[PDB]
Design a protein around this ligand. Structure first.
Ligand SMILES: *[C@@H]1O[C@H](CO[C@@H]2O[C@@H](C)[C@@H](O)[C@@H](O)[C@@H]2O)[C@@H](O[C@@H]2O[C@H](CO)[C@@H](O[C@@H]3O[C@H](CO[C@H]4O[C@H](CO)[C@@H](O)[C@H](O)[C@@H]4O)[C@@H](O)[C@H](O[C@H]4O[C@H](CO)[C@@H](O)[C@H](OS(=O)(=O)O)[C@@H]4O)[C@@H]3O)[C@H](O)[C@H]2NC(C)=O)[C@H](O[C@@H]2O[C@@H](C)[C@@H](O)[C@@H](O)[C@@H]2O)[C@H]1NC(C)=O
Ligand SMILES: *[C@@H]1O[C@H](CO[C@@H]2O[C@@H](C)[C@@H](O)[C@@H](O)[C@@H]2O)[C@@H](O[C@@H]2O[C@H](CO)[C@@H](O[C@@H]3O[C@H](CO[C@H]4O[C@H](CO)[C@@H](O)[C@H](O)[C@@H]4O)[C@@H](O)[C@H](O[C@H]4O[C@H](CO)[C@@H](O)[C@H](OS(=O)(=O)O)[C@@H]4O)[C@@H]3O)[C@H](O)[C@H]2NC(C)=O)[C@H](O[C@@H]2O[C@@H](C)[C@@H](O)[C@@H](O)[C@@H]2O)[C@H]1NC(C)=O
Ligand SMILES: *[C@@H]1O[C@H](CO[C@@H]2O[C@@H](C)[C@@H](O)[C@@H](O)[C@@H]2O)[C@@H](O[C@@H]2O[C@H](CO)[C@@H](O[C@@H]3O[C@H](CO)[C@@H](O)[C@H](O[C@H]4O[C@H](CO)[C@@H](O)[C@H](O)[C@@H]4O[C@@H]4O[C@H](CO)[C@@H](O)[C@H](O)[C@H]4NC(C)=O)[C@@H]3O)[C@H](O)[C@H]2NC(C)=O)[C@H](O[C@@H]2O[C@@H](C)[C@@H](O)[C@@H](O)[C@@H]2O)[C@H]1NC(C)=O
Ligand SMILES: *[C@@H]1O[C@H](CO[C@@H]2O[C@@H](C)[C@@H](O)[C@@H](O)[C@@H]2O)[C@@H](O[C@@H]2O[C@H](CO)[C@@H](O[C@@H]3O[C@H](CO)[C@@H](O)[C@H](O[C@H]4O[C@H](CO)[C@@H](O)[C@H](O)[C@@H]4O[C@@H]4O[C@H](CO)[C@@H](O)[C@H](O)[C@H]4NC(C)=O)[C@@H]3O)[C@H](O)[C@H]2NC(C)=O)[C@H](O[C@@H]2O[C@@H](C)[C@@H](O)[C@@H](O)[C@@H]2O)[C@H]1NC(C)=O
Ligand SMILES: *[C@@H]1O[C@H](CO)[C@@H](O[C@@H]2O[C@H](CO)[C@@H](O[C@@H]3O[C@H](CO[C@H]4O[C@H](CO)[C@@H](O)[C@H](O)[C@@H]4O)[C@@H](O)[C@H](O[C@H]4O[C@H](CO)[C@@H](O)[C@H](OS(=O)(=O)O)[C@@H]4O[C@@H]4O[C@H](CO)[C@@H](O)[C@H](O)[C@H]4NC(C)=O)[C@@H]3O)[C@H](O)[C@H]2NC(C)=O)[C@H](O)[C@H]1NC(C)=O
Ligand SMILES: *[C@@H]1O[C@H](CO)[C@@H](O[C@@H]2O[C@H](CO)[C@@H](O[C@@H]3O[C@H](CO[C@H]4O[C@H](CO)[C@@H](O)[C@H](O)[C@@H]4O)[C@@H](O)[C@H](O[C@H]4O[C@H](CO)[C@@H](O)[C@H](OS(=O)(=O)O)[C@@H]4O[C@@H]4O[C@H](CO)[C@@H](O)[C@H](O)[C@H]4NC(C)=O)[C@@H]3O)[C@H](O)[C@H]2NC(C)=O)[C@H](O)[C@H]1NC(C)=O
Ligand SMILES: *[C@@H]1O[C@H](CO)[C@@H](O[C@@H]2O[C@H](CO)[C@@H](O)[C@H](O)[C@H]2NC(C)=O)[C@H](O)[C@H]1NC(C)=O
Ligand SMILES: *[C@@H]1O[C@H](CO)[C@@H](O[C@@H]2O[C@H](CO)[C@@H](O)[C@H](O)[C@H]2NC(C)=O)[C@H](O)[C@H]1NC(C)=O
Ligand SMILES: CC1=CC(=O)C(O)=CC1=O
Ligand SMILES: CC1=CC(=O)C(O)=CC1=O
Ligand SMILES: [Cl-]
Ligand SMILES: [Cl-]
Ligand SMILES: [Cl-]
Ligand SMILES: [Cl-]
Ligand SMILES: [Cl-]
Ligand SMILES: [Cl-]
Ligand SMILES: [Cl-]
Ligand SMILES: [Cl-]
Ligand SMILES: [Cu+2]
Ligand SMILES: [Cu+2]
Ligand SMILES: [Cu+2]
Ligand SMILES: [Cu+2]
Ligand SMILES: [Cu+2]
Ligand SMILES: [Cu+2]
Ligand SMILES: [Cu+2]
Ligand SMILES: [Cu+2]
Ligand SMILES: [O-]
Ligand SMILES: [O-]
Lengths: 628, 628
C-alpha cells in the first residue's frame, strides 16, 4: 500500500463531512454495507506553547485564535505537549469496521510516549492498547511507533497519552466510531451527528502537570484546575463571572432551528473535578454512555468525570438566538469566590444575538429537572436524579452474564495511605512515593493496601522475562495480598478466559467529596449497583449480598467503561472476560493512577491472545552480574 | 560479588574522608600502589520538590535546611528532578583505577533517562557513555540500568542527565578521580584536597527547564537564570544585594589558617551564562583544567562556563575571619538592577566573624589582577588576562600530535537559523523546531547550516539497524553537507583510528555576547588557538593558516574537554583519535544542544571498539509494512 494515499486531515469542516471532496476521507456519514476504509494518521508529539508565534494577536484579534497551529486555551502562556500543534489533538472520525493506522513520532525532549485508545476493545490487537510496561514498551524520543487496529466497537471513544502526566499537558483527543444512521440503535433520535459536535470538556492548569507532582506544600498544594475549556478555549473567571485572564472568546456550538443534533461529550478532565453540564432552555436526550447505546432518557443536566463520555441530543426547538452552555465544576475549591466553571454559546444559524449578562458559577440551567449521574448516587424515589445503574442498554445480554451467578467476584477497597498518620517517611534514607493534596495531606494511593507499581517489561509480550517475585503474592483466599501502612507490587488478578466477573469497588478512605472514576481497559461492563455506605455496612457485606442474590438496579443495565464511585460509597460492575490479555483497571483521575490506584486483570494465558508481532520493541532492566 | 558490601554513601564528612571507618569507603586519600576498589552507587531518579516536607521550617530554621532529603536551592518552591533527593546529586569521590558501578533506577513519570560521565574517556566501555541514540537506548520509567566502567583518567570530572532538559531540573553532580598526593603532578601545591571543597556552581531558574522550551514569547522569553547556587544553596538577590527571596543561608567554605586547600570548581551551569569567580583577599593558584594538570598560574579571578572545571589552590594565609566568595554572572540580563550573581562565605576555623555589608553585583574581588579564561580572549600583551591557549600542560605530548601536520582538519561554523529572517514557518502544516530567546528571536541551532537530529537507534550498538539515509551525505569535499535556511540530519564525521585531528570552531552568527562552550566526549584535546574574528577574516582562512603553519599559542598547550569560544571568534583544538566509537561534539549550553548545536565523530569501524555487551538494550522505530 501507499499509506500516504489514506492520510487523514487533522480537522474536517461540517461541509467536508456532509459532502466529502475525497473518496478516501474517513470522517463521513457511514453507508450500510459499504467496504471499510483504511484511515492513516501521521502524528508528531512536540514540546509546544499556548499563544506564542502561531497565535499572532489572539485574543485581542479573535480570528488569530483560529490559526491551525495556535493553541489558545485560557490565554495564559505556558509550556504544553501537543499532537500536531492542537489541543485537543486531532479527532479520529471513522465508521465501524474501518482500520486505524497511526504513525506516532515522539519529538518530546527527555520524554517517553505511548497513546491509549480509551474504549477501543483491541480484541486481536492487544499489543496496540498503549499502556507502558503492560502492552508495550514506551516510545523513546527520536523513534516512531505505528499503531494498527480496527474500529470494531461503536461509539464516542477517546485517546490520550498513557505515559506519566502528559495528558493534562495536552496529549488527548476524541475517537468517534459512527454507525450508518439507519443501523444505529438510536439513529431515529437525531437528524445530524457532525464532527464539530464531538466536544471535549477539558480541565486546565496554568502550570505544567509535572509542576503539581509531587506538588508544592506551601504555595500551591494539590492538583486543582483553574478553569475548563470546551474544545480549545475558554476564559478564566471568578465565581461571579468576572474575568481574571485574557478575554479568550467562548466556544460556539452551532445548531439550526427545527433539527435535532447528536452532541458527543467527552470527559477530557484529568483532575479530580467533575462537571455538571447544562444548556439554557434546552433539555438533553441521553442516547449513549461511553459509546454504548441506551434507551433514551431526557434530563436537564448530567455530571461527567475523567474518562466518561455521554451522547445527548439537543432539539433546536427554542426561539432562535444565543443560549448559554454551563459547565459547573464539582469539587472543593480554594474559596466560594474562586469556584471553577466555564461557559460556551449555543448559537442558532441565521442569528447574531449578543448576551449581555455572564452567568455565574451558581447560574447553571439544571432548573430542578432530572440530573443524570448525580453526586452521591442521589437517585432514589423522589430525589430528582437518575443513576447510571438505573439506565437500560439498547442491546440485550448476548452471553448469559446477568442471568448466571458470577464465576469470579473481586472486591477492591481503593483509597490513600496518609503519611502524616504514621512515622515520618522523610530524611531516613528511603524513597516512598507521595503527592501533596490541597489540604496538605501527604498521600500514596492504594487498592487493598497495595500501591500499584509497574513490572520492568510488558507482560503481554515479555511475560517470560519478568521475575515472578514482582507480582503481589496470592494468599489462601485466592486473592493478591502484600508480601507497614501499605506495600508496593504488581497487583495482578488472573481470571480464566470466558469467566463471568463481578467487581465491587469501594471508597474506603473517603475525602473531599471525591467520586473516583474507575476504568477497565479492553472491555465495557454492566453497571450492577451503586450507592453510599451506611455506618456498620462493610464493602465485604455488600459484595457478598450482591453475589448471593444476583441483585441489579436495572433488568438490563447500561454498559459503561468508566464508573464514578459515589463519595463514601461503592459501585459493582459485571462483564464476560472473553477478551484475552493484560487489562488495566484504575482510577481515571491522573494523579491517582500516577500514585498507584490501579490493578491489572490477566484474562486467559499466553497462546489465548495473538503471538507477539515480528520486531515488536523489547525492554527491561540491564543489570549484568558483577564479577572480579 | 555481593555488590551491597561495596555500596558508597551519598555524602562523606571531611573527618570520614581523612580517617575512614570502613575499608570499602572509596572517598579517601589514595595510597600509591594500593589495590583498586569497587565503588557501588545505588541511585533513584525521582520527581521531587524544593523545600516541602523534608525541609521543615527551612530557612527560618537554618539547621532544617541541612536535612539529608531537603533541597533548599534559593528557597523558591518548584518541581525538580533528583538523584537520591539531593541537588547537586551524590558525588562520586574515588581514586584513579577504581571501578565505578552505578545502579540507576528511573522513577520519573513519563520521562526516559541516561546519565553521561562528563570527562571520563570510557576507552573499552564506550557503551557506558550515557548518550541517548548514540551509545545506548534511554532507560524507560520503571527500569534500572547498571553503568560499569573504570576511573582510568584523573581529575575533576562531572555527571549529568544527557536526556532532554533534566540537568537544569537537578540531575547533576561531581566525579573526583584523585591520585595519591605523592604522584599527582601538582601534589606539592596544596596540603588538603577534601570532598567538601569539590564545589559545583549551579545556575537556577524558578520554573522547570521544560517551561522554557520552546519558551514563552511575551511573558518570559529565553532561558536566563535568576540566581546561582554554590552546591545546594544561595538566596535570590538584586544587583544591589537586596534579597527578593527567602533568606536562604549563603554556602560556607571552611579553611584553616596556614594550610593550602585544593578547590575543585565545576561549571554546573546549564544556561548561556558564564560566571567570574573571585575570593576577597585570596589569590587563586590554578593547577588543573577539566581534570588535566597544568603548570600552576596565580590569578585573582577566573571565568567558567557550562561543562568546564577549574582546580584552584586557596592559601589560607590572611587574617583569620570571614571572606566573601563572589560569583558574577556574565551575560545579558533583563536590566542593570537585575544582574545575576551569588555569594558564599570563606570561613577560617576558630572564627565567627559576621560580615555586615553584602557585596553588590559589581563588588567582586578581581581587583585589576589577572583573569583566567577572559571574555573575548582578551589576553594579548598588556591586557591582564590569561587565555586557556596560553597555559602549559604538566604532561608532555606522548603521541607526536603537536609536532606533526594534522591528518584531519574539520571546520565547524556554529550558530542559529533565525526564522524571522525567512518565510513564516507556522500555520502551514509543518513542524520546524524552534526556541524563543530573550530578545524574542525564534531560533534553531546549526553547525555548517545543519541542525543535528538523532538516529532512531544508537549506532555504537545498532549500526546495522540504521538506514544510511539518516546521516548527512558526504560531498565531493569529503565533508558532510545538506541533502532552505537549514537542513536536519545525523551530522556524522568519520575519522580513522589513530588520526591526528584538528577542529576549528567559529561563532558565525554572533549574538548577545555568547561564549559557546564546545565539549568533545571520549577525549581531552590541546587548545591550539583562540581569538576574535577581524572583519574580512573567514573561518576558512584561519583554519587553512593554522593547518599549513602548525601555529600554537603555547609550546605545550593545556588539555581541556570543554572550550568557551570567544564571542564573534573561534577556537582550534587538536587530539589523537585513539579511542574508537561514536563521540558527541556539541555546545554544552543545554538549550543549544536541545536545538541541534552538535555533530558526531565516528572514530574507527565496528570491531575497533568492543563487541556489544550481552543483553544490551535495543531500540528503534516500529513501522511494520501495511498490506490489504
Ligand atoms: C456526598 O457525600 C459526602 C459524604 O457524606 C458522608 O457520608 C454519607 C454517606 C452520609 O452519611 C453523610 O451524612 C456523611 O456526611 C459529603 O461529604 C461530607 O460532607 C460532610 C458535611 O456535610 C463532612 O462532614 C463535616 O466535616 C466538617 C469538617 O470536619 C473536619 O474539620 C473540623 C473542624 O476543623 C474537625 O473538627 C473535624 O474533625 C474534621 O477534621 C465538620 O466541621 C462538620 O461538623 C459540623 O457539622 C456536622 C453536620 O454535618 C455536625 O455533626 C457537627 O457537630 S459536631 O459533631 O461538630 O459536634 C459540626 O457542626 C462535618 O462533620 C464530611 O467530612 C464530608 N466527607 C467527605 C468524604 O468529603 C458530600 O458533601 C459535600 O462535600 C463536603 C466536602 C462539603 O463541602 C459539604 O458541604 C458538601 O455538601 C456529599 N456531596 C454532595 C454534593 O452533597
Ligand atoms: C565581546 O565582543 C563582542 C563582539 O564585539 C564585536 O566584535 C569584536 C571582534 C569587535 O570588532 C567589536 O568592536 C564588535 O563590537 C561584544 O558584543 C558586541 O558589543 C557591541 C557594543 O560594544 C554591540 O554593538 C552595538 O549594538 C548596539 C545595538 O544594536 C542593535 O540595536 C540598535 C538600536 O535599536 C540597532 O540600530 C542596531 O542595528 C542593532 O540591531 C548598537 O546600538 C551599537 O551602536 C552604537 O554604538 C556603536 C559603538 O559601539 C556606534 O558605532 C554606533 O554609531 S552608529 O553606528 O549607530 O551610527 C552607535 O552609537 C553597537 O553597534 C554588538 O552588537 C555586540 N555583539 C554581540 C555578538 O553581542 C561584547 O560586548 C559586550 O556585550 C554586548 C552585548 C554589550 O552589552 C556590550 O556593552 C558589552 O561590552 C564583548 N564582551 C565584553 C565582555 O567586552
Ligand atoms: C487578525 O488576524 C488575522 C490573521 O492574521 C494571520 O494569522 C495570525 C495568527 C498571524 O500569523 C498573522 O501574522 C497572520 O497574518 C488577520 O487576517 C489576515 O491578514 C493577512 C494580511 O494582513 C492576510 O494575509 C494576506 O492574504 C492576501 C490574500 O491572499 C495576500 O495577498 C497577502 O500576501 C501578500 O500581501 C501582504 C500584504 O498584506 C504582503 O505583506 C505579503 O508579503 C504578500 O505579498 C506578496 O504578494 C505576492 C503577489 O504577487 C504573492 O505572490 C506573495 O506570496 C506575497 N509575498 C509573500 C512571500 O508573502 C497575505 O497573505 C490573511 O489572509 C488574513 N487571514 C485571515 C484568516 O483573514 C487580520 O487582518 C485583518 O483582516 C484581513 C482580512 C486583512 O484585511 C488585514 O489587512 C486586516 O488587518 C487581523 N486583524 C487585524 C485587525 O489586524
Ligand atoms: C530546627 O529544626 C531542627 C531539625 O528539625 C528536624 O528536621 C526538619 C527538617 C523537620 O523534619 C523537623 O520536624 C525535624 O524535627 C530541630 O532540631 C531537631 O529537633 C528534634 C526535636 O524537636 C530532634 O529530635 C529529637 O531527638 C531526640 C534525641 O534523640 C529524641 O529524644 C526525640 O525523640 C523523642 O522525643 C520527641 C520530643 O522532642 C517526641 O516527640 C518523639 O516522638 C520521641 O519520643 C519517643 O521517645 C522514645 C524514648 O523512649 C523513643 O524511643 C521513640 O523513638 C520516640 N518516639 C518516636 C517514634 O519518635 C527526637 O527524635 C532532632 O534531633 C533535632 N535535630 C537536629 C539536627 O538538631 C530544631 O529544634 C530545636 O533544636 C533541637 C536540638 C531541640 O532542642 C528542639 O527542642 C529545638 O526546638 C529546630 N529549631 C527550632 C527553633 O524549632
Ligand atoms: C493561572 O492559574 C493560577 C493558579 O496556578 C491563578 O492564580 C490564582 O489567582 C487567584 C485569583 O486572582 C488568586 O486569589 C487571589 O489572591 C490574592 C492574594 O492572596 C494572598 O494575600 C492575601 C492578603 O493580601 C491573603 O489573605 C491570602 O491568603 C494570600 O496570602 C487575594 O488578595 C485575592 O482575594 C481577593 O479577591 C477574591 C476574589 O474576588 C475575594 O474573594 C477576596 O475576598 S476576601 O475577603 O476573601 O479576601 C479578595 O477580595 C478583594 O478584597 C479587597 C479588600 O480586601 C477589595 O478591595 C477587592 O476589590 C477585592 N477583589 C476582588 C473582589 O476581586 C484572591 O484570593 C490566587 O491566590 C492565585 N493562586 C495562586 C496559587 O497563585 C491565576 O489567576 C491564573 N491566571 C490566569 C490568567 O488564568
Ligand atoms: C523566581 O524567578 C522569577 C522569574 O522566573 C522572578 O520573577 C522576576 O522578579 C523580578 C524582581 O522582582 C521582576 O522585576 C520587577 O518587575 C516589576 C513589575 O514589572 C512590570 O510592571 C511595570 C509597571 O508597573 C513595568 O514597567 C514592567 O515593564 C513590567 O511590565 C517591576 O515593578 C520591578 O521594577 C522595580 O524594581 C526594580 C529592581 O529594583 C527597579 O530596577 C525598577 O526601577 S525602574 O525605574 O527600572 O522601573 C523598579 O523600581 C521600583 O520603582 C518604584 C517607583 O517606580 C519605587 O517606588 C520602588 O521602591 C522600586 N523598587 C525597587 C527599587 O526594588 C521589577 O522590574 C521580574 O518582572 C520577574 N520576572 C518575571 C518573568 O516574573 C522571581 O522574583 C523569583 N523568585 C524568587 C524568590 O527567586
Ligand atoms: C488494609 O489495612 C487495614 C488496616 O489499616 C485493614 O483494616 C483493618 O482490618 C482489621 C481486620 O484484619 C480490623 O480489625 C481493623 O479494625 C481494620 N482497621 C481499619 C478498618 O482501620 C483492611 O482490612 C485492609 N484491607 C484488606 C483488603 O485487607
Ligand atoms: C551556510 O549558509 C550560508 C548562507 O546562508 C553560507 O554563506 C554564504 O556562502 C556563499 C558562498 O557559497 C556566499 O556567496 C554568501 O555571501 C554567504 N552568505 C552569508 C555568509 O551570509 C555558508 O557558507 C554556509 N556554510 C557552509 C559551511 O557551507
Ligand atoms: C485525599 C485527596 C486526594 C486528592 O486528590 C485531592 O485533590 C484532595 C484530597 O483530599
Ligand atoms: C541568539 C541567542 C541565543 C540564546 O540562547 C540567548 O540566550 C540569547 C540570544 O540572543
Ligand atoms: Cl474533526
Ligand atoms: Cl484475541
Ligand atoms: Cl493552576
Ligand atoms: Cl465523610
Ligand atoms: Cl561527598
Ligand atoms: Cl576500545
Ligand atoms: Cl526563572
Ligand atoms: Cl557583533
Ligand atoms: Cu483513558
Ligand atoms: Cu482505557
Ligand atoms: Cu481516584
Ligand atoms: Cu488506563
Ligand atoms: Cu557534560
Ligand atoms: Cu561529555
Ligand atoms: Cu551554544
Ligand atoms: Cu554531551
Ligand atoms: O486510561
Ligand atoms: O555533555
Amino acid at each position: 500500500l501507499n499509506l500516504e494515499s489514506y492520510l487523514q486531515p487533522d480537522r474536517i469542516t461540517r461541509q467536508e463531512f456532509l459532502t466529502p471532496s475525497n473518496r478516501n476521507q474517513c470522517a463521513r456519514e457511514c453507508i450500510a454495507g459499504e467496504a471499510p476504509k483504511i484511515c492513516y494518521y501521521k502524528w508528531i508529539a512536540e514540546d509546544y506553547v499556548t499563544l506564542g508565534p502561531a497565535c499572532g494577536n489572539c485574543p485581542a484579534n479573535v480570528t488569530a485564535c483560529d490559526a491551525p497551529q495556535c493553541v489558545v486555551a485560557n490565554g495564559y502562556e505556558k509550556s504544553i505537549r501537543t499532537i500536531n500543534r492542537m489541543v485537543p489533538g486531532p479527532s479520529i472520525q471513522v465508521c465501524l469496521g474501518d482500520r486505524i493506522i497511526v504513525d506516532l513520532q515522539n519529538k518530546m525532549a527527555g520524554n517517553e510516549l505511548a497513546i491509549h485508545w480509551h474504549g477501543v476493545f483491541q480484541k486481536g490487537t492487544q499489543y496496540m492498547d498503549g499502556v507502558p510496561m503492560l502492552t508495550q514498551c514506551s516510545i523513546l524520543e527520536g523513534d516512531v511507533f505505528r499503531y494498527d487496529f480496527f474500529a470494531n466497537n461503536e461509539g464516542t471513544l477517546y485517546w490520550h497519552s498513557h505515559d506519566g502526566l502528559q495528558x493534562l499537558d495536552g496529549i488527548q483527543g476524541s475517537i468517534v466510531v459512527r454507525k450508518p444512521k439507519s443501523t444505529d440503535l438510536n439513529g431515529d433520535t437525531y437528524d445530524l451527528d457532525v464532527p464539530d459536535h464531538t466536544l471535549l470538556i477539558l480541565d486546565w492548569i496554568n502550570t505544567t502537570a509535572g509542576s503539581r507532582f509531587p506538588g508544592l506544600l506551601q504555595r500551591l498544594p494539590g492538583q486543582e484546575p483553574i478553569t475548563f475549556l470546551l474544545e480549545d478555549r475558554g476564559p478564566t473567571m471568578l465565581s461571579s463571572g468576572q474575568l481574571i485572564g485574557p478575554p479568550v472568546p467562548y466556544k460556539e456550538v452551532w445548531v439550526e432551528s427545527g433539527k435535532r443534533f447528536r452532541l458527543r461529550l467527552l470527559g477530557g478532565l484529568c483532575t479530580v473535578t467533575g462537571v455538571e453540564f447544562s444548556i439554557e432552555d434546552h433539555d438533553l436526550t441521553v442516547i449513549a454512555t461511553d459509546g454504548g447505546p441506551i434507551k433514551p432518557v431526557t434530563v436537564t443536566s448530567f455530571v461527567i468525570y475523567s474518562g466518561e463520555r455521554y451522547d445527548v441530543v439537543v432539539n433546536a426547538n427554542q426561539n432562535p438566538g444565543t443560549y448559554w452552555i454551563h459547565m459547573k465544576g464539582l469539587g472543593v475549591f480554594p474559596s466560594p469566590d474562586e469556584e471553577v466553571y466555564q461557559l460556551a454559546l449555543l448559537r442558532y444559524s441565521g442569528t447574531n444575538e449578543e448576551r449581555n449578562e455572564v452567568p455565574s458559577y451558581n447560574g447553571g440551567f439544571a432548573r430542578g429537572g432530572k440530573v443524570l449521574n448525580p453526586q452521591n448516587a442521589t437517585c432514589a424515589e423522589g430525589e430528582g436524579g437518575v443513576c447510571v445503574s438505573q439506565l437500560v442498554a439498547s442491546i440485550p445480554d448476548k452471553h448469559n452474564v446477568l442471568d448466571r451467578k458470577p464465576d469470579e467476584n473481586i472486591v477492591l477497597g481503593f483509597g490513600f495511605y496518609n503519611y502524616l498518620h504514621g512515622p515520618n517517611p522523610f530524611n531516613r534514607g528511603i524513597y516512598d512515593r507521595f503527592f501533596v493534596v490541597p489540604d496538605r495531606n501527604l498521600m500514596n494511593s492504594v487498592m487493598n493496601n497495595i500501591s500499584f507499581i509497574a513490572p520492568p517489561s510488558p507482560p503481554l509480550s515479555q511475560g517470560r522475562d519478568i521475575p515472578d517475585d514482582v507480582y503481589c503474592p496470592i494468599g489462601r483466599s485466592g486473592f493478591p495480598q502484600c508480601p507497614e501502612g501499605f506495600c508496593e507490587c504488581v497487583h495482578l488478578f488472573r481470571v480464566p478466559l470466558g469467566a463471568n466477573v463481578q467487581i465491587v469497588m469501594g471508597d474506603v478512605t473517603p475525602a473531599s467529596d471525591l467520586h473516583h472514576p474507575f476504568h477497565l481497559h479492553g472491555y465495557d461492563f454492566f453497571v450492577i449497583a451503586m450507592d453510599q455506605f451506611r455506618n456498620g455496612e462493610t464493602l465485604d457485606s455488600i459484595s457478598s449480598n450482591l453475589l448471593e442474590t444476583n441483585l441489579k438496579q436495572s433488568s438490563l443495565p447500561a454498559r459503561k467503561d468508566t464508573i464514578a464511585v459515589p463519595s463514601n460509597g461503592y459501585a459493582a460492575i459485571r462483564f464476560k472476560a472473553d477478551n484475552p490479555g493484560f487489562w488495566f483497571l484504575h482510577c481515571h483521575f491522573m494523579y491517582h493512577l500516577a500514585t498507584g490506584m490501579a490493578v491489572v486483570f490477566q484474562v486467559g494465558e499466553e497462546g489465548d491472545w495473538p503471538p507477539v508481532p515480528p520486531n515488536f520493541p523489547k525492554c527491561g532492566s540491564y543489570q549484568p552480574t558483577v564479577s572480579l
